[PDB]
Every structure is written in structure tokens, then in C-alpha cells.
Amino acid sequence: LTYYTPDYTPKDTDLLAAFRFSPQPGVPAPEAGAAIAAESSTGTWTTVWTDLLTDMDRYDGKCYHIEPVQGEENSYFAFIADPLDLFEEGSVTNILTSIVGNVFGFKAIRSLRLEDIRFPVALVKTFQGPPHGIQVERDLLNKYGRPMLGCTIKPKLGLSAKNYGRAVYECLRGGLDFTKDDENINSQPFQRWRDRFLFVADAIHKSQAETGEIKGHYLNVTAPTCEEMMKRAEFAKELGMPIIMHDFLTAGFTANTTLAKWCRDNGVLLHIHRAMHAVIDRQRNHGIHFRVLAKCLRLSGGDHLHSGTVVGKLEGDKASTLGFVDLMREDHIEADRSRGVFFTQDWASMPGVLPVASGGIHVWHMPALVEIFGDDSVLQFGGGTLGHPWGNAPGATANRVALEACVQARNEGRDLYREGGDILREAGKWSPELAAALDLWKEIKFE
Amino acid sequence: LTYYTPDYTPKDTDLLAAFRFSPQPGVPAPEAGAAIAAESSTGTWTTVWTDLLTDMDRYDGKCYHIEPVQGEENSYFAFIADPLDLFEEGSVTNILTSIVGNVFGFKAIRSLRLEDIRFPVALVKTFQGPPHGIQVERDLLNKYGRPMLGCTIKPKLGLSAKNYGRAVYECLRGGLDFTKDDENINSQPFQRWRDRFLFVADAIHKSQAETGEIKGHYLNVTAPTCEEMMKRAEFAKELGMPIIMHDFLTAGFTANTTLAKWCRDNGVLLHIHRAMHAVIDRQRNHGIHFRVLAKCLRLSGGDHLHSGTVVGKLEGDKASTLGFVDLMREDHIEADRSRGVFFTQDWASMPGVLPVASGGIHVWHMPALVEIFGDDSVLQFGGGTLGHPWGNAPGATANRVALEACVQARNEGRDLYREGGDILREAGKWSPELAAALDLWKEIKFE
Amino acid sequence: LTYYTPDYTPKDTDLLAAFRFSPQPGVPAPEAGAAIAAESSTGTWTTVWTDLLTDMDRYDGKCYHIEPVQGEENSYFAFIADPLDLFEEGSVTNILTSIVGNVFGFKAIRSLRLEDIRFPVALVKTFQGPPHGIQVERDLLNKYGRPMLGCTIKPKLGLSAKNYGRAVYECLRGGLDFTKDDENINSQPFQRWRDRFLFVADAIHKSQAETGEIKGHYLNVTAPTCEEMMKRAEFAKELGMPIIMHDFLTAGFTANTTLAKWCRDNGVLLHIHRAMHAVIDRQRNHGIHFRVLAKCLRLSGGDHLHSGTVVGKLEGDKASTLGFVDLMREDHIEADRSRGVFFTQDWASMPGVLPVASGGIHVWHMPALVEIFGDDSVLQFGGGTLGHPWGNAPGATANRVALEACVQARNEGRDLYREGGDILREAGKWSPELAAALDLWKEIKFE
Amino acid sequence: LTYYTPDYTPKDTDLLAAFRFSPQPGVPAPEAGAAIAAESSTGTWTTVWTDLLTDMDRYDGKCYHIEPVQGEENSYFAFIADPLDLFEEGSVTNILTSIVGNVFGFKAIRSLRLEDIRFPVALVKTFQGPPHGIQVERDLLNKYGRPMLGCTIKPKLGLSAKNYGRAVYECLRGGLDFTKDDENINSQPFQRWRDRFLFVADAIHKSQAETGEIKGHYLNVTAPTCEEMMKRAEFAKELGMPIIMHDFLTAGFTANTTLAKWCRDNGVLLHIHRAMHAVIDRQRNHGIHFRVLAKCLRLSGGDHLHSGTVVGKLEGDKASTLGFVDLMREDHIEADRSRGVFFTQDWASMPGVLPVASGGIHVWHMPALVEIFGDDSVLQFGGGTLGHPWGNAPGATANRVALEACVQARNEGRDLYREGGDILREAGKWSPELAAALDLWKEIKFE
Amino acid sequence: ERQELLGQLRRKEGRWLAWARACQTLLKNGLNPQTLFEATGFEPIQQNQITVAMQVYDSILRQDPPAHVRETYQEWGSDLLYELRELDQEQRSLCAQLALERKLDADQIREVAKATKDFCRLPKQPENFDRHPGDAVAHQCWRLAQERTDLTERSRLIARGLQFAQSAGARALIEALLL
């Protein structure tokens, strides 16, 4: 166990991952770092009969750091290193299996949190990538100046064929870009997966016929078996739906990589609903960070990704989210600890994933929303208590007016994060739906 | 938000799951319980235009209980209830997606840990179950009185096609029942997945030819794509290997349920490595418990399951480990909080999964092992520094002698937790390999 | 043979079936009940060599009751119980094979009639269910306030490709909802199955083009070989026909369930014509009851199913039919001996089957029909001598007018069993076809 | 309604079926006969608009007889006819659907029983026929002088894979020709469906290796759907089993005709268990006769057929069974009312089905057995209480010894109905197992 | 060493001990498990069933069963004694005498043998309690019945929950429950 801080000049490929590390007391610090390095590959120098003959020194995962956390008791990040050959081409599953499969909870340290990951240029290129780029998705959708629009159909259940279908039509027609079905609206015996697809497909079809804009709904294909998944996807391509949604973390990376390769094979856009992403990433001392899932899910490709929003959050947390939010659209990213990006990572022209925020947000945050995500994002609505008394299609129309006025007033150059409220309020002067939106909430949080 | 404890008379199907719950201060306790109940389904009574017309009261996930933890500050156990129709037949993915997909980290409470789950008889019956029973696996393997034997081939890497397969032949001809790959010997470019399968297969076949016992190796089929998985499985059935191993939690439940239905379709036994488990189940305030994964993985069927061991652990932890060992061999289980089984669960003749323990255990731990797991288990070796200074096949022979003497001395009725060291001492009197095993370690931990 | 009435405390799953029982004289009654219980499973405790080493007591089909028939010589009702594990998931064939395969005619009793069967909630959830619900069928057909309309194309034979399809055209153009052919129509060499499908398909399509209502006529697919059956049924799917009809009892559940699984795998309705249901359910002392058969059909997964009518029948018989009529729309049914429900049965959200009545009924029977089947049914015409001396199209139109005008009477609140004749009299005051319908028959059977 | 007895000169093809007919009083007899004739096809001269333009007179089903039953009150058999074109090639389902689908229970007569059927030479040579002849089955099995041997396994359940596999060894090895499981053995939770096949198959293969006689087991493939059925049956051919058993009447004729065409396609013998027969054929006034099912099941081909036995029933009934027993072996059969053959039937070289009897008969009826079925049959054992107190394999040997000696005795020319008991007495003089068989029962029923 | 000792196995002669004494002595001839059943007629599953209660009978010669617990126990309790393989020498005859004074359906003591196994593990017996199946079952409700809260799932242990007429302590502790 002599793999503490031997410098060694960390190299080009190198898989330089990091860790938020907390020992149990009675443990010297770099011995536990080399314990991480040994547990990552070929555990603790396991004695064999070939040791005396041949030296096993080509596949060692030696680390090269021991830096204490600024403002923390017993907490210092440790930079490891795994050279190349421990990983299969094509797999994110092998990546997670090799790095963190048994390393956590090895009964010596108190806690450990996989914080960051560096992916080399020579492993990035061998994956599939996303099915379509941000560029290519805008090419297929003709949405060139504004972020995309979306709401969730309410309520969740008891809202069957026609009930779920007709509702979608109104919400969509009102002027939105997308709608997404309830996350757990898989094939449940009050609402069979067949007719929901048929009516939503027809619903979207009729919508396009009227509005003249390319429209789409996020169809859920979270399936028990992979053959069920391929069957529902092949029906989604049979009727010509432009996009399907599929949660990644409960369904699994093998299903997700297979579905992404399918979406490349038939040219359909791909949405990913971060489901149960807090059961791993919430606590600040134990787990993995959602950032590592974000990079891994850019690799096992997807065209959209729920990422959440910043409304009244803490400053470093907001920046942290932003840090990981700009660690996907860009393909050459520097390293900031305060944004949480520990590594300078290249992507070698992988056309990264659109983020999309979904929280309890009404139109009052519209000016702030764009002010944050710029232009390259999708924005959601309909989470909490924001049932528009006037109607869902008037709500969608007010939303469309709100985003158009916000994008144009950002183009005006007037501070959209300062004169936001005034803009929307002034805009609603001809749209009564937006006036009702002005009536139902407010934005006197700050300047 | 009135779902606090309306006593509910909790019913037959009911999906009665539980939670280890810890609020942030400034939060009253049962309001946060009904917040869990609302976030589980149809969030926070989302206002629609039809709530005045129709009452949405058939699918409410409904909390009914509150009870503070004995010996803990600011924590209690909440008992949730979800009636039937929120779940698809065939899926464990839909189960996890409905129960914990967004409920965690909802920025009101400090922490939350999915502790337990009750599965009803009317949802248990519609799943696949395991591919083979404990009964049926013993039927296919003719191993009728003793636990099964296994070691891990060492070292991990740099130990290519002829090397690995003929080391498997040596370590299996020594007298073991099984040998496994570890988690990360997938198709890596120093060792292609083809020839490892071919040589391990030929080693199994020649070893069956010599020893006259049915033998097998745990072949790893952790694959990037599902088509790669089915291809490697179909080659595993083409040459007639009795069992394949496949990690569940990084590969994903869709791939695992598909592979289990495949193993039913061709009659091959199925091993599951619990890789990446310690990310989720280690901390005692946040995550899910490995017990819930154990029940869910009995459902999305598997014939083996790594479960770890008890060597010098804490008493209540050892009792909990015995608890979820008992959750997967018995088919009618009562409810003990101290063993961690909160619910009385039926299984309706699902022939449950064999456990298998793998820790840093040498032969002196063997009189504890048959003391703990009884007869219905598999036992592993080769984890840490236990390189036999004579050889791997002498080590396997000493292991076989050790387990045979231990099973027969348990049949002797000598209380083998007390005299097991002396049992091995009289056992090694003719076997020099077991005498070396006596020489290399010791058992004077405790009586 | 001691299984007579040991009171058993009959349980949740339990498969509690009943029997109308009649011994031959010289037989004591409960010994013959335990003879039924033994013949149902593990006959008369077949002597074995393992009977003195192991007690076979886990799978005993166990009788528990005896009760003589009110108003009958030498007959009683025996309540059988079969625990769980004697039945396969997915099969109704295994259900019938286990319960009544050899039990009848065992040369001790005079006669025996399988009267009723209570399915458990942990075995009825593992079946397929119907392909579409009553809800979902109305969703696909947009028929929301009235029962559906239908007539049989007359004559039966000699009425070939252009004749039959164009003959249905007029009928369908008249205003009906459906038009199915009789059983004897399969691929017979005067009328090949090809061109009938083609012409009926084109007739449906042009009739949808003219009337603007969703239309569809039953297309018998009763086939010799499963492959052939599916082959001919596949044509309908390619020609976009919304529904196919298929007799259940002569074709077999094995070929029925398989076709039923393919019916919900393509999203097409399902028409099950009870053919040959009088030579197995007619006699009141020997056979099985239609109610039991009906339950099995619901388990299979059919959309519609001929249930006959009540016109001038006996009071208890009418109620009996009504009792079983609800045994397939309601999903929680109590137990009435005079009606039929022998034991309360849950269905756990299986969206039950529409009934449809077909007897010698003209339009004056229509105010009885909506009096009896309420709203959730389909009504047939064209059985006996009711050839409209004006024409089939006019006749069909008249029928629609009647029901349409009638349904209004139900919503009106006039007690339509009393005034329905006068309702039709004021209805025909502008429609001359309905006036001819008034002319051709009468309603003075009773008040 | 004029079809009473117009003498018709009944013709070559003609489908001359008969009926046991019983009116309700107040009904003249030949009007009810023409009512049967009208209800069989184109009911009761249904009026139409083309009745005054074209006469529907090519497809009428007129009768030609009305003879009263010798020794019965109100009971006379009718001789209805149906020309050719009402029936599809390939189907028995269409035959039953056309003849008796609605004719029974038409609320005019008291009771009706389909007694017999004549199959024309221009419609009985267009069906598949059996997969193999009696000739061809003997060719594949090399059993040339004696009837074949078989004993059902006992217990019926709780007797799992290795326990139900090793138990078949003794029964088969002991010297029998076949063994077959009961209908209730399909895929259950207490005993998979593929596992059993594997074990059973191996037993057959090792028993062929030891005894040098071609051996086989009747494997049950009664399946829920068709795909599953074919799938499970497909495995049997892959394993190499000579015969599969499949019940006909609960599984259905579509599944059975498909499975028979499969057995022709792969050359596997075919057994049929007549489960659920006693529902339909027991009462002497209402149903169909098992004879009609026997001819229909010779058509939808099968190589074996349970037919029961005449242990000690009434002479009148004994002859009846014989009458229908010669309605398969022979291919040109005359007409005996006191035998069943109502009309002479040709078969045009269809190589008819082997019968096999299975009742509570031990080795005491062996002498009588050879006396009845001659040589072309299979004989069963193991029904009731005949557990051999020595063992199942000693019982098997005794059985074979008995039949073998019995066959020789019949060949000798001693009138073996008279001396068969003494034959077995001299036969058991060296075999102690047969001496135990002599000890356990007796034969002094009659001369 | 063995001449014609398998014919009694072949003819199925002997009650149950003439099978087990024979198979155990015969197992040291040279043939494996798949050879003694490949002729005589003994399924491997059962071959082991009576290949242990042989040694359980070697274990239960601690107390003499007083001629009321050995009459019909000569070749019985096959699966009954087969399943008990984790009991304490001090309870193997004590659980069997319970199984022959209770007369339930043949496999019912598999569940008492697990809670009994847990009872003989806690570092020290509970005071005012003793080590026995009758007490273990009575003390099994303490960490179950008591843990329960509702009369639906707490009144079912009024017969099987107690029935430890071999310990007054449990009877004196099962009095404050008529609440």
C-alpha cells in the first residue's frame, strides 16, 4: 500500500476521477487514499504464486492527490487515476462497474462521494454520442431563436384515453412546443399504453395540421422488458412521433444505450426524465454527484435532460448547477472548483445535450429563466398549484406570449433580470390571458 | 393536505411500504408524512378545472401512521399505502419509478431512507419469478447435503485466454463447485470476451470428464447493448454452460428482467453480482436498504445473489443480515423490527433465491459459515490476502475437505460454533493441505 | 375419505367453486362430497410407498359444506376448495382441466352440474384481461350515450362477394353501428374468405366516408389452423378493421387466448359469438352453467360476447341472466343465490366485457331492452321473420330512430317499461319507416 | 316448413348425420324434425326482398326419416342431411359449428342428443389425417405382436423434478412401454414445465441405453396460448422424444389440428387424453356421443386415444363401446344400431387411431383385456388402489410378464376368456412379482 | 464387505431403520450417490432424507424416550426429523416429543426451529424464562405479537402465539393482554 502522492505527471488518457473523502478516525489519510486506489483495481496487492515471478504493474490505479476541503472538518478531495484498459468501448455500465462498484462502504472510512470524472478524448470518441445534436434537433424542429415550451398534463391519473388525449390537444394547441405524459404513466390497467399512444399521436397530428408549427409530445416508453421497449419504440416510429421520453436511472444504462442506438437508427429525438436522481445525489458526503450522471448520460446519448432550475437557491449551489449546465453544451470546458468542475475536459465534437428545467415555476420567473439558460434550453410548466382558472390553452397562449416578449426584450438589451416584471406586465396589455397570469402571482423577491 | 393518520384499516393488497424519515426543523411531522403521501402520487392536490366537478379519490397514495424511532433524535417511521393500480405487471422498474422517483430530496425534510416494502399476493404472482428454484438448482446440480463451493480467480487482470481458463481448470479440478469472474472482466481489449468463454467452457467440460461431478463457472455477460447481452447469452447456451453471472444495479432492471426471462426460456441458472450497491445503501439516514433490492431482485428473478457475510459485525446488524437472508428462502415471513422486517409478507410459492457470502474469509471462518447459513447457500473464497503458498488446487482440495468435515460435524450434533476449530484440527490430520490451512491462520477471535 | 365438512375457515385465495349435486341412491351424501374433493386432486389418496414416510397434505382439494336444494328431491350444493398451486398463470384451459376433466360421470352419482366459481385476486390479476375496456371501446368508437346497434345480414348463404359486401353497405348506410355475419360463413367454397373481407372492408371505408360516424362490422375469423386463423385475422388488421368476431367454445380457449393476446397486441376490438352453448349448459342437472363460462370468457379478454335476452321468460331465469349480466360489468359483486352470484367476487380493475343480446326481437321489444340492459350493451336484430317489407336500409334507420328516441325516454324519466309503446307511436309520426315498424308488430304482451 | 320425410334418395356425399330426439308435448313430430332441418341452415325460411325473385333451394338441409325408439316413451331418431358446401376443408371446428351450434335448446323440444355422423368420401380425404398410422407407429416402435404397456405415475402432485424423474425410471425400466402424466401437471409453481421435460427426457434416454427397447413417455403440452403450446412442444422434438400427449376437448380443435399438422411436420407420435368428456356425453337424452368425437378426432388427427374399457358394465353398453371401437381401426364399416354404426362409413385409407383403455383394472383383467381389444391397442395401469406393496418396477415387470404370457395363451388357442386365471397362475410360478400380483387380487367375477 | 444386503432395500422390507442403517454402512463401499439408486430404487432427495435422521437418532440417545415416544416413532417423522438440523442437543429430543404430543401436519416445526435457534444465541437467556421450544414460541410473540398494534394481527396468537404450558413465566407475562 504505497500509492499515496507519487506525482507521476498525470497524463492524456488517464481517466482522472476525483472523490470527496471522509475517513473514520484512527485512520491516516494517504493510506486510505491508496486503499481507494487498490480497491479500484486488483485489491490490496492480492498475493499470488506469480508475484515473485512477474510484477503486476501495468494496470495499477495509482492516485496523485491529498488536498483538504476549504471549510470542513475531516474532508479532503483525492485525485485518482486509471490508465486506459480497464474499460470497454460502448459501455457506461462498465465505467460505473469498474470505478464505483465496491469501493464505497469498505468499512474503514466514514463516507465517500464520487464527485467528478474526466473522460479522455480516446474514450469519448468510441461511444455512440447523442442521437441528434442541439443543432440537428433545431434543424428537425425549426425553432431557431427561442427556448422551447412545455407543460405537464394535469392531473396524473384517472384521466384516460379521450380525457388524457383531448386535454393534451388543448394544452398543445394553445401554443406550446411540447407536452410530457406522467412519469409513472406506463402501462397501468386503468390506462393501457396502446390507446394513449394512438390518441396522443392523432392529437399531435391534428394540432400540426392547424397551427403550421412542428409539434411533438414526449411519449413514455419505460418498459419492463427490452422487447417491450423496442416494440413501443417501433410503434412510436410507425406513426411518426418526433420524440420519445425514457427515464435513465431506474430503467438502466443497458436499456438506455440500446434505446439511444435505436434512436440513431431511426432518427427520432430522445428525452430523458431524471427519475430517482436524489436517492443517490442529495447528501453532501455520500453518493455520486448528478454531474457525473450528466456526463455519463451525455455519453450514453440523449437529446434532452431534466436538470432542474435555480429560483431562490444558494449562490454556490446555483453556480454549481450552472457549472454542470455549461459542462454539456460546450465541447471544451475548463476547471472550476466553485462551479464544481474539477477537470478540463474535451468532448471532440460531441454535439451535447439540451438541458430542461422543471420546478414550481410560473411566468413571473420567465424573465429570470431565459436570463439563466440563455437560448439553448427547454422550459417546463405545470408542476405545483398553477392551474389557470381561465383554461390550459389560454395558459399555453399566455406562456407563448410571455416567452416571445421575454426573448425580444432580452434582444432589446434592457436588463431582463432587472426589468423582467415590468416587461411581462407591460406586454399583457393586449393579451388578457397574460393579464390573468400577472394577476395570479408576483415577483417582488428582489431587484 | 389531510392524510396524516386516518387509521385506514390497512388492507390485503395495499403495497404497504415504509420509510425512515427525518425532517428539517421548523416542520410539523404528520404534514410531512402527508407530503410523502402526496408526492408519491398526484402531487399536493394539483388544482385542475374539474376538481369542482369530479373528486379524484380513487388513486390517492395514503399515509396512515407515525412512530418515533427508539433511540434517535428527530426521526420516525412513516407507513405509506398505495392501493393497486399504480403499477404495471412485469416491471420492477415501474415499482421503483412510482415509489421513489422524485419523493427524495424535496427540500423540506433533511433526509429519507426507503427502508421496507410489502408486496401483495396479487402482484407477486404476475411476475416471472426466478428462472429456477433452490430445489430445481439442486436438481440440476446434484448437490444435496452441503453448501456449494466457490473461489475468485486471482489476479484480476493481465491474466489472458489460456492463462485464465486453465487457471480456472486448476482451481476447479481442485474440488470446488464454482468459480466466478469478478465484475469488470467484460470485453476489454487485453482480453476479448470470445476466447475467455471458449477456454473456460472447455475447462468446465474436461473437468466434468475427469471428476464426475457437475461443474460450472459464473460467466460474466454484463454488456453495453441488450443485443450484445443476448448474443453472449446465446453463445453461453450454445456450448452448454449451466450458469451465467450478471450484475443487476449498474446494468439495470430492464436488462435484468429480460435476461431472466431468457434464462427461463432456455433453462440456464442465473447469478447476480451486487455491484454498485454501496452507493445507495450504506448511510443510515438516506437511500434505500439492500433488503428492498433483495425482494425486488427476487421478483425480477435470479437464482443466486451476493449478500455478504457476518464475521465480526455488530449484533443488530448481524440479526438484520439474517433477516434479509430469511426474506428470500422462506415463502411466509413474519415481521420483526429488530431484524428489519417491518411487514408480514407472503410469496405464494415463489421458489426464492440462494444467498452467497463473499468477504475476506478463510477456512477458520468456515465453522461460523455453516453455523449461520445452514445448508441452503453458496460460500466464496479468494477475496483478500489468502494466496495459498502451496497452490490454488491444493487450496480448493483443503476447502472441500473442510466443508465436508464441517457439514458432517454439524450432523454430529457437536455445537459447532464452540468446537469448530478442533473439528478442523482433527480434519487436517491426514490432509496436508488442510494442515497448511491450519498453519496460515487462526480462530481465537472469541468462543 | 374424511373431507366431509371440516368447516375449513374458507380463505382469501382458495378457488371456492360450487356444484349442483345429485347422487344415485344407496350413496351417503358427504362421502360423495369428499369423493368430489378427492377426484378433483390426488384421487382417493392413491396408495404409494412414500405415504409411510411423507404426508401428502399441502395440495388437498378440500370440500367443506353441504346444503340441500330448496324445493328439489335428492340434490344439494357442495362447496369445493382448491388452494392455489393447482393452476397455471395465463391459462383458462388448465383451470377447466384441473376442476372438471374427469370429475363428472364417475359412476357413483346420478348427475352433477358445475354451477359457480369464485376466482381469487392473486390469480385473476395474472391473466391478460380483455383487449379493451368498455371505457376504451367507447373511446375508440365515440358512442357515449346509447347502446350500440347491430343486425345480421340475411340470408345466410348463396349471397357471395359483391352481394354480401354491398348488402352490408345499405344496412351500414341505414344508420346501424355494426353488422356481423353468422357462424357458418368461414372459408366455404361458394364464398372464399378473401373477397368477403375485401368487399366488407371497402364497404366500411366508404360508409365512414359518407356518414361521418365510426363504423365496423364483425368479420368471422374462425379458422382450422392457428397459423391460418392468425393469417386471415392479420388481413383485417392491415385493412384497418376495428373489430373481429371469433367463436370461443368450438375453436377452443387455447386458440382463443392466443388470438386474444394478438387482439390487444394490435389494438383491435374483439367479438366472441357463443356458438354451441346450448349443448353444455341447457339441462338443469348436468353440465356447466353459462355464468361460469362467461367468467372464463372475461378472464380470456374478449370485448363483446352474446348473452341472449329476456323477452317472455320465467322470472327467476330472467333474474339469473341479469345476475350473470352484471358479473361482467361490475368489478365488485356480492353473492345472491336467486340471481347467480354464489360467492362475492372481486375483479381488481379488470375492465369487463360488454354483453349483447340476440333473439327474435323487433322494435317493440326495444322499450324492454333499454329497460333491461341500461346503457352498456349492444343490441341485435334480424334473427327470425323480420324482413322489412320496405327495405333493410330503411329498417335499420327505423331501428336507430327508435333507440335514439327511446334513450331520450330513459333520460326523460317516463317509466319506459309502462309507456314505451306510446313513445314509439309518437316517434313514428314523422318517420314512415318507423311507422311501418309500428304496423308490422305490436306490444300488448303485458303492461 | 315442409321438409318432413320427402324420401330424398339419400346420396353419396350428403353428410348424413342422425339425432336422438325428444319433443316437449304439444308438438307434432315431423314439424320439429323440419325445425331441426331449418335450424341447421338458413333458419325457418327467413323472409327477404329477393324471395319473390330467387328461390333459395341449393343449400337446404332437409331430413328423410322419423323412426320411434324401440323401448322408449317419446323418443324417435331423425335422419337430417346437409349436401356438401356448408363445410370448410381442414376444419372440424366448422363441422361442429355448422351442425350443432344453436340447434340444441331451441325451446320447443325437451331434449336432443347428436348421436351419429356420416363423413363423405369427397370430404374425409381432404383432412390431414393422423400423423402416423397404426402401421407406422409400430414401425417406429418395433412392437409387432403384443399390445403396448403403460402405467400413470402416482402421486399426482408434490412429486417434483428429480423425485418425479427418478420415479419414472423404475416404472419405465421395470419393463413397460410407456408412462404418461395426468392432465393436471401443466406449468405450476410447485413444478416448472421445462425442468420436468429435461429430467423425463434423460430418463428415457438412459432407459433406452440399458434395455435395448425403444421407449417413450407421454409428455403433456397442454398450453395456455398457441405460441407457448408450439414452443413447449418444439423443445420436445429438439430433445428427441417420440411422443407427446395433449388433451383435445378443453384445449380446442384449432389448437389440436395445428398440433397434429406440426406432428406431421416433424414426425412425432401423438397422444390425446379425453379430458372433460363426461360433461357432454354421459346423459342418454342430451349432448353428443363420444363416438362423434371419436370420428372427429380421427379426422383432426391423433395417433392414440383414451377410450376406456368394458371391465364389467352392462352387455348392451359393452357392445356400444365395441361399436365405436371399430370406428377407427377399420376403414370400411357397416351399420349396426345395437353397435352405434347408424350409417356405413368409408375412410379411404385413413390409417386410423389406436385406442387405449384406462380404468381401475389390475393384472387380473389382463386375460380378459387381450380378449377384447385383440392386439391393436395400448393398455394402462395405476388408476385406483393398486400400489404394488413390493414396488413399481417389480409391478411393471409383472404387468409385462402377464400380458406377454396372456398374448401367448391367446395365440395358443385356449379360449382365454375361460382359462385366463389359470394361465396367470402357471405364469407366476417362477416370477415372484407376478405371484404377488396373484396374491393381491382375484378373478372370480364370472366364468 | 456387503453380499446380499441390498435385496431388503430392493424388496422394500423393513420399517425405516433397516433402510437407514443399511444405506449408511453401504455408502462406504466405493459407489457414489448415483449408483445405489441406479438399481435398488431410491431417489437422491429421499436417499439423504433418511441419511441424517439416522444420525439424529444417534443424537437423541441422551434421554431414554420412555416407551410412549418410540412406539410409532420407529420409522416416522421423516421430513419432521429431516428438517431439524440446526437444533441444540438439549432440544432435538425435546422438539420431537413436542411433535409427537401435538400431532400437526407433518412439516410444521420448521418455523419453531428458527426462532429456537435464535433463542440459543443471545448472550444469556432471559430471566424468568427457560431454553425450550414451548418458551421460545411464547417468547417469539414478545418480538412479534407485542410489536403488533392491531387486534386483527394480534389476536391470532391467542393459541399458537402461546401454548407454552411448560413455562409459568410466559403465562404470568401473557396476563396484561386481556386489555
Author numbering:
A (entry chain H), B (entry chain A), C (entry chain E), D (entry chain D): 19 to 465
E (entry chain L): 13 to 191
Give the authors' words.
To elucidate how Raf1 mediates Rubisco assembly, we obtained a higher-resolution structure of the Syn7942 RbcL-Raf1 supercomplex expressed in Escherichia coli using cryo-EM. The cryo-EM density map of the RbcL-Raf1 supercomplex was solved to 4.28-Å resolution (16,022 particles), with variable local resolutions from the central to the peripheral regions of the complex. The Syn7942 RbcL-Raf1 complex possesses a four-fold symmetry, with a diameter of 150 Å and a height of 115 Å. The core is composed of eight RbcL subunits that arrange as a tetramer of antiparallel dimers (RbcL8) and four Raf1 dimers located at the peripheral surface of the RbcL8 core, sitting at the interface cleft between two neighboring RbcL dimers. Raf1 contains an N-terminal α-helical domain (Raf1α) and a C-terminal β-sheet dimerization domain (Raf1β), with a flexible linker between Raf1α and Raf1β. Raf1α competes with RbcS in binding with RbcL, as both of them interact with the similar regions of the RbcL8 core. Two Raf1α in each Raf1 dimer are interlocked by the Raf1β dimer (electron density is boxed), clipping the RbcL antiparallel dimer at the top and bottom sides. The atomic structure of the Syn7942 Raf1β segment could not be resolved at our resolution, likely due to the structural flexibility of this domain. Structural analysis of the RbcL8-Raf18 complex revealed that Raf1α interacts with three RbcL subunits of two adjacent RbcL dimers via mainly salt bridges and hydrogen bonds. On interface II, where Raf1α interacts with the adjacent RbcL dimer 2, Lys24 and Glu50 interact with Tyr187 and Lys224 residues of RbcL-A, while Ser90 binds to the Leu71 residue of RbcL-B. This structural analysis revealed explicitly that Syn7942 Raf1 is important not only for the formation and stabilization of RbcL dimers, but also for the mediation of RbcL dimer–dimer interaction to facilitate the assembly of Rubisco holoenzymes.
